[PDB]
């Protein structure tokens, strides 16, 4: 048997308010979680996740093969050279089970200065036809702002946990420029399930996605109630229990860099499960030019022997590296 990872449920509601002592007590919880397995569930987050799951299902189950080509990223459709990040990520029956749809900041419009300048990692979102998916685009853009709000509150908690003022990260996380993404992932039930879409870990576990650290500052993740994630600890890989009422939070490798690995980016992997399910991450990314000066909360003077890294450089290279390591999703 596999042991259960310690993933505490933290009521994050004080991070939306003005009770500073209560926010400090949340921050302590975040600190403890981040120093232990690296994961926690945010509860009392205020987001309607049941509705998110329903609207996402309505999309995944009604989009057609024609629409998927028309929305496909460059990796699947050579005609779409501008779509590196945003669009549809196709399955390959008999070979690849997963499929997904990614979108970015809704404020990246054709007139946005970074779109005009053609700065890497910024793209204008692509959407299906409104008549075929009524309400979907509006729902998805409002969800971006709902989970942006939750993420801003969680960043106040991380900042306080590290001994900083509450806007230490959130001042870099702004609606006009954030590189944050939503990915609506469909993991399907398949009968038969093709062995080619199943990877095997060194310890024999059947996987859908191999070990990795997240390319993010933090990751704010909703998933269906099907257990699938595992975290590497000093005691081996342990199962993260599902909670389809909460958001699963962890740090990405930008947080590890900034904190000199005091808050590690936990290594985790996705087990293969033959079940129809959803995995809906929001990757909390800063702006392209955002630079946080690294520090070390374990050293008396707080200094670190790491160099500042702009977020845009981090993200463009991190996303390419993750594809190289674990495959195009
Ligand atoms: Fe991950």
UniProtKB/Swiss-Prot annotation:
Transmembrane segments: none annotated. Keywords: Antibiotic biosynthesis, Cytoplasm, Iron, Metal-binding, Oxidoreductase, Vitamin C. Its EC number is 1.21.3.1. One of its GO terms (molecular function) is isopenicillin-N synthase activity. Isopenicillin N synthase; part of the gene cluster that mediates the biosynthesis of penicillin, the world's most important antibiotic. IpnA catalyzes the cyclization of the tripeptide N-[(5S)-5-amino-5-carboxypentanoyl]-L-cysteinyl-D-valine (LLD-ACV or ACV) to form isopenicillin N (IPN) that contains the beta-lactam nucleus. The penicillin biosynthesis occurs via 3 enzymatic steps, the first corresponding to the production of the tripeptide N-[(5S)-5-amino-5-carboxypentanoyl]-L-cysteinyl-D-valine (LLD-ACV or ACV) by the NRPS acvA. GO terms for biological process: penicillin biosynthetic process. The record marks 209 as: Transition state stabilizer. This is Isopenicillin N synthase. 2-oxoglutarate binds at residue 277. It catalyses: N-[(5S)-5-amino-5-carboxypentanoyl]-L-cysteinyl-D-valine + O2 = isopenicillin N + 2 H2O. It is found in: Cytoplasm, Cytosol. Pfam families: 2OG-FeII_Oxy, DIOX_N. Residues 174-286 form the Fe2OG dioxygenase domain. Isopenicillin N binds at residues 85, 89, 181, 187, 279. Changing residue 281 to L: Abolishes the catalytic activity.
